[PDB]
Structures are given as structure tokens and as C-alpha cells.
Ligand binder design. Structure first.
Ligand code: HEM
Length: 151
């Protein structure tokens, strides 16, 4: 459970992310795909992309990055009271997209890295720790739904 102070650190940096949702989403998905190429293979939509320049040039990838970060922002703003948000996300990611929990760890790492690059003044160690806790809570709660469903 995050404290109120931890949530404030999380949402303070998140408010900065929302100034450029699409650029963050691009940076995060590209980092994910480059650092963990098995993740790109899960996207029939994107697996034709073979270089970072091609990824950066894809408007469709930029659009999907907005989709991802909009869903995550809605979750974070619930401050842990996110059952209604995680139900459909866990269902689609477990049963349709077939995404291991480990790949959610990978995207969490990419998120933290990009937030640190773009917002150092609002993403010192205290905020890094708080965002790590928020993304761990996300993963814990998704994992419980995966377990229910046999994934
Ligand atoms: C912060 C973590 C993530 C969030 C918030 C998120 C959110 C979303 C959302 C909102 C959608 C569209 C609706 C849906 O299908 O449920 C989506 C689609 C999808 N996601 Fe994620 N996602 C996350 C992590 C991942 C990861 C790590 C992968 C793969 C490694 C992945 C693979 C997919 C795929 C394959 C689709 C379908 C794309 C398409 O063909 O349109 N997601 N995601």
C-alpha cells in the first residue's frame, strides 16, 4: 500500500508526463522493444518495424503509446482503487494478447527510465521509489487476475 505522500510523488511526475503523452509513449514503447525484443514479437501491429528510426516514424506506434499511457494514467489516478480499470486490461492481456507478467515488469522499467530522462527535477530518488511501488502494485493486482484465469 502506497502512502498519501508516495501517491503525491507519483502523480506529480505523472502530471508532467501528460504535457506530452505521445512523446512519452513513443519513448517508452521503443525502449521496451529495443531492450526486450521478445516484446515486439507480441505485436502483429508493429513487428514489421526493424530499426529505431522506423519505430520513431510510425504514427500508428505513436497512437498506441497514447492508448497505453492514457490507460495507465487512469489507473494511477485511482491511487490503488483501480479494480474496475484492471479487470478488462488483465483479461485482454492474459487471454487475448498473451502477455506474461514479466513483460509488464519490462514496460515498468521502460516507464521509469523515460520519466527519469524527461523529468529529473520531479523524479529524484523519492519519486523513483514511489513510482516503482505504484507499478509494482499494478503488477501485483494484474498478476492476481492472471492467476485466477490460469495465466
Ligand atoms: C503499463 C502496461 C500496459 C498498459 C496500461 C497497456 C494498455 C493497453 C491498452 C489500453 C490496449 C488496448 C485495449 C486492450 O486491448 O486491452 C492494449 C493493447 C495491447 N497491448 Fe498493452 N498495455 C500494457 C503493457 C503491454 C505489454 C508489456 C505488451 C507486450 C509486450 C502489451 C501488448 C499489447 C497488445 C499486443 C495489444 C493489442 C495491440 C493491437 O494490435 O491493437 N501491452 N494495451
Amino acid at each position: 500500500v502506497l502512502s498519501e505522500g508516495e501517491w503525491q510523488l507519483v502523480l506529480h511526475v505523472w502530471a508532467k508526463v501528460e504535457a506530452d503523452v505521445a512523446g512519452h509513449g513513443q519513448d517508452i514503447l521503443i525502449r521496451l522493444f529495443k531492450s526486450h525484443p521478445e516484446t515486439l514479437e507480441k505485436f502483429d501491429r508493429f513487428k514489421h518495424l526493424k530499426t529505431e528510426a522506423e519505430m520513431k516514424a510510425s504514427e500508428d506506434l505513436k497512437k498506441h503509446g497514447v492508448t497505453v499511457l492514457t490507460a495507465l494514467g487512469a489507473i494511477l489516478k485511482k491511487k490503488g482503487h483501480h479494480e474496475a480499470e484492471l479487470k478488462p486490461l488483465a483479461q485482454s492481456h492474459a487471454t487475448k494478447h498473451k502477455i506474461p507478467i514479466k513483460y509488464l515488469e519490462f514496460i515498468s522499467e521502460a516507464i521509469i527510465h523515460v520519466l527519469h530522462s524527461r523529468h529529473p527535477g520531479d523524479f529524484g530518488a523519492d519519486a523513483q521509489g514511489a513510482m516503482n511501488k505504484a507499478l509494482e502494485l499494478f503488477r501485483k493486482d494484474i498478476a492476481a487476475k492472471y492467476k485466477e484465469l490460469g495465466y
